Design a protein around this motif. Structure first.
Motif, PDB file in Angstrom:
ATOM      1  N   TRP A 293       4.215  -1.751   8.326  1.00  0.00           N
ATOM      2  CA  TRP A 293       4.142  -3.126   7.889  1.00  0.00           C
ATOM      3  C   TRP A 293       4.450  -4.103   9.003  1.00  0.00           C
ATOM      4  N   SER A 310      -3.269   3.296  12.311  1.00  0.00           N
ATOM      5  CA  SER A 310      -2.944   2.092  11.564  1.00  0.00           C
ATOM      6  C   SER A 310      -2.836   0.801  12.307  1.00  0.00           C
ATOM      7  N   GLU A 313      -6.299  -2.085  11.683  1.00  0.00           N
ATOM      8  CA  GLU A 313      -6.602  -2.660  10.377  1.00  0.00           C
ATOM      9  C   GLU A 313      -5.830  -3.937  10.129  1.00  0.00           C
ATOM     10  N   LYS A 314      -6.194  -4.611   9.087  1.00  0.00           N
ATOM     11  CA  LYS A 314      -5.581  -5.847   8.695  1.00  0.00           C
ATOM     12  C   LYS A 314      -4.169  -5.445   8.387  1.00  0.00           C
ATOM     13  N   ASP A 315      -3.229  -6.306   8.686  1.00  0.00           N
ATOM     14  CA  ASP A 315      -1.858  -5.884   8.576  1.00  0.00           C
ATOM     15  C   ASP A 315      -1.307  -5.736   7.165  1.00  0.00           C
ATOM     16  N   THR A 316      -2.055  -6.018   6.130  1.00  0.00           N
ATOM     17  CA  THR A 316      -1.611  -5.776   4.798  1.00  0.00           C
ATOM     18  C   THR A 316      -2.343  -4.533   4.207  1.00  0.00           C
ATOM     19  N   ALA A 317      -3.073  -3.838   5.015  1.00  0.00           N
ATOM     20  CA  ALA A 317      -3.877  -2.698   4.500  1.00  0.00           C
ATOM     21  C   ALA A 317      -3.058  -1.394   4.175  1.00  0.00           C
ATOM     22  N   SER A 318      -1.912  -1.183   4.866  1.00  0.00           N
ATOM     23  CA  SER A 318      -1.228   0.096   4.752  1.00  0.00           C
ATOM     24  C   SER A 318      -0.662   0.403   3.431  1.00  0.00           C
ATOM     25  N   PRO A 320      -1.695  -0.678   0.386  1.00  0.00           N
ATOM     26  CA  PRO A 320      -2.777  -0.252  -0.505  1.00  0.00           C
ATOM     27  C   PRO A 320      -3.334   1.107  -0.070  1.00  0.00           C
ATOM     28  N   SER A 321      -3.480   1.340   1.226  1.00  0.00           N
ATOM     29  CA  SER A 321      -4.012   2.593   1.690  1.00  0.00           C
ATOM     30  C   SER A 321      -3.172   3.800   1.256  1.00  0.00           C
ATOM     31  N   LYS A 324      -3.650   4.486  -2.443  1.00  0.00           N
ATOM     32  CA  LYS A 324      -4.910   5.269  -2.670  1.00  0.00           C
ATOM     33  C   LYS A 324      -4.640   6.726  -2.297  1.00  0.00           C
TER      34      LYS A 324
END
Ligand SMILES: C[C@H](CCC(=O)NCCC[N+](C)(C)CCCS(=O)(=O)[O-])[C@H]1CC[C@H]2[C@@H]3[C@H](O)C[C@@H]4C[C@H](O)CC[C@]4(C)[C@H]3C[C@H](O)[C@]12C
Ligand SMILES: C[C@H](CCC(=O)NCCC[N+](C)(C)CCCS(=O)(=O)[O-])[C@H]1CC[C@H]2[C@@H]3[C@H](O)C[C@@H]4C[C@H](O)CC[C@]4(C)[C@H]3C[C@H](O)[C@]12C
Ligand SMILES: C[C@H](CCC(=O)NCCC[N+](C)(C)CCCS(=O)(=O)[O-])[C@H]1CC[C@H]2[C@@H]3[C@H](O)C[C@@H]4C[C@H](O)CC[C@]4(C)[C@H]3C[C@H](O)[C@]12C
Ligand SMILES: C[C@H](CCC(=O)NCCC[N+](C)(C)CCCS(=O)(=O)[O-])[C@H]1CC[C@H]2[C@@H]3[C@H](O)C[C@@H]4C[C@H](O)CC[C@]4(C)[C@H]3C[C@H](O)[C@]12C
Ligand SMILES: C[C@H](CCC(=O)NCCC[N+](C)(C)CCCS(=O)(=O)[O-])[C@H]1CC[C@H]2[C@@H]3[C@H](O)C[C@@H]4C[C@H](O)CC[C@]4(C)[C@H]3C[C@H](O)[C@]12C
Ligand SMILES: C[S@@+](CC[C@H](N)C(=O)[O-])C[C@H]1O[C@@H](n2cnc3c(N)ncnc32)[C@H](O)[C@@H]1O
Ligand SMILES: C[C@@]1(C(=O)O)N[C@H](C(=O)O)CS1
Ligand code: SF4
Ligand SMILES: [Cl-]
Length: 346
Positions: A293, A310, A313-318, A320-321, A324
């Motif tokens: 984060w 990591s 990617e967009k810094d808020t992606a982790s 949600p990733s 999933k």
């Protein structure tokens, strides 16, 4: 024979001889049976919840000169950064808004914040009703005490290697004895305490890895962080061999068998050396994941080792990733702070 070692593992005959044999056998069938055993122990003791710890790497300044680490003080080919306290608190609040129930604050050993700025940060984040974990290195007892009074819950301090000679060579500012005294101090102060080691360090032997397992078992740590050594080109260990993923995975599996109720992450280093390495590790004993984060533009500067995942990617992606990932693994996200839930045995 592999069948015999597995039987002793199943009966908890955790002798140095059984652990050495488990680490030395390279038979596929044996390894797969070991991994199945650790996966089943994980399910039975800690269930299907995978606990999410959102990590904010808030400074890459370090006073120490560890030979393996890209943040070592002698590395001039690295732009250094520090987040401001406000940036750290707001970034923690964004992770809580995204559903993180633990915030991990990690940095090099950066004197600037120590100890009072850290305490102020910890108090602000604790108002958000989540667990706080610190991973700041070795500091005086007084600093640890202040951070506990400020509300910190947990502290991660990997023991790195339980071989005191190798420890002092790789960490020339300090010692295994100092590292252990810090771990013991943290436990006495009431922190949930994390240790753990790197696998595949130059000069580290199989017997050394057995000693790491027994150390862990001896102190009954709440958390154990294990990953491979990954050589970094701006360090003295640049040309040494990277740690083996399968051997590192066996260390994770054995840690779970030895410490069945412990919290064990599938580390970023495991997902760096092998594509999909975290997901495999979550199926071989691990039950925790730590989504990065750290915001841009600092994320890309926390270069402990090269190739870190990591970062693009967009810094808020982790977050949600990893949610999933947990679903596709047929697992569930953590419902509470994910503190250790000890199962008392005989
Ligand atoms: C069962 C199918 C199809 C075999 C076939 O062609 N029919 C084959 C095709 C590719 C194979 C995987 C890869 O080899 C990677 C890896 C090698 C390890 O060593 C053993 C495990 C693993 C995951 C393999 C498992 C299995 O063997 C796979 C899925
Ligand atoms: C997904 C692959 C390959 C499965 C496969 O492709 N095998 C042939 C087809 C078999 N199927 C049953 C799907 C169809 C059979 C009919 S068929 O006619 O196709 O043969 C299988 C093969 C070996 C399996 C790992 C090992 O155990 C070790 C370990 C045990 C843990 O606990 C869970 C984690 C881990 C890493 C396992 C994960 C996964 O599970 C693997 C990779
Ligand atoms: C932050 C923003 C704006 C609104 C806001 O500031 N929201 C605070 C929520 C605080 N909590 C997470 C503690 C709520 C728990 C309620 S729950 O009913 O889930 O227990 C909100 C609006 C939509 C929310 C996403 C979606 O939903 C999809 C998904 C659901 C997962 O689950 C968690 C992850 C994810 C990606 C969500 C993250 C975050 O949250 C979002 C981006
Ligand atoms: C395909 C990649 C190599 C990719 C590459 O870098 N080329 C190699 C590197 C490490 C390998 C896994 C580990 O051995 C652990 C485990 C052993 C079981 O036996 C079979 C399944 C499993 C998950 C292995 C599958 C596969 O074989 C991996 C992912
Ligand atoms: C928004 C992104 C895309 C998607 C990808 C995977 C989705 C999650 C998983 O589906 C598991 C779970 C299902 C529950 O129903 C509600 C919550 C949760 C955590 C989902 C939230 C959200 O929907 C996710 C993060
Ligand atoms: C970078 S430090 C930050 C926290 C604090 N400075 C400390 O050392 O405990 C976090 C961990 O990174 C790991 N690490 C450092 N360099 C590495 C490398 N080259 N390869 C794999 N892991 C490494 C070590 O195990 C260390 O405990
Ligand atoms: C967060 C940490 C850990 O295992 O606690 N994982 C990091 C990693 O694998 O990159 C190094 S320290
Ligand atoms: S491992 Fe921790 S203490 Fe050692 S150089 Fe890296 S950041 Fe500094
Ligand atoms: Cl944690």
């Amino acid at each position: 024979t592999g069948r015999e070692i597995l039987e002793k593992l199943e009966r908890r005959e955790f002798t140095r001889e059984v652990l050495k044999e488990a680490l030395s056998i390279n038979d596929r069938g044996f390894n797969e049976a070991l991994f199945k055993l650790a996966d089943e122990i994980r399910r039975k003791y800690v269930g299907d919840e995978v606990h999410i710890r959102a990590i904010i790497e808030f400074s890459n300044v370090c006073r120490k000169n560890c030979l393996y680490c890209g943040l070592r003080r002698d590395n001039k080919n690295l732009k250094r950064y520090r987040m401001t306290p406000e940036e750290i608190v707001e970034r923690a609040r964004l992770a809580v808004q995204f559903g993180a129930k633990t915030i991990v604050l990690q940095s090099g050993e950066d004197p600037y914040x120590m100890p009072d700025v850290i305490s102020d940060i910890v108090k602000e984040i604790k108002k958000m009703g989540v667990a706080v974990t610190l991973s700041l290195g070795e500091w005086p007892r007084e600093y640890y005490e202040k951070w506990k009074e400020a509300g910190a819950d947990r502290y991660l301090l990997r023991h790195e290697t339980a071989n005191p000679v190798l420890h002092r060579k790789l960490r020339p500012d300090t010692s295994f004895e100092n590292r252990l005294n810090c771990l013991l101090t943290l436990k006495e102060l009431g922190y949930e305490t994390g240790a753990g080691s790197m696998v595949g360090l130059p000069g580290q032997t199989i017997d050394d890895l057995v000693d790491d397992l027994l150390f862990l078992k001896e102190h009954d740590f709440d958390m154990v962080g294990i990953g491979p050594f990954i050589p970094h080109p701006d360090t003295p260990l640049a040309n040494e061999k990277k740690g083996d993923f399968t051997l590192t995975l066996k260390m994770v599996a054995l840690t779970r068998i030895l410490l069945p109720d412990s919290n064990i992450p599938a580390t970023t280093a495991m997902g760096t050396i092998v594509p999909g390495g975290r997901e495999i590790t979550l199926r071989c004993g691990a039950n925790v994941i730590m989504p990065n984060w750290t915001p841009s533009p600092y994320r890309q500067l926390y270069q402990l080792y090269p190739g870190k995942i990591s970062v693009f990617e967009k810094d808020t992606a982790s977050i949600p990733s990893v949610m999933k990932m947990i679903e596709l693994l047929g697992r569930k996200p953590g419902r509470d702070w994910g503190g250790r839930k000890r199962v008392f045995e005989t």
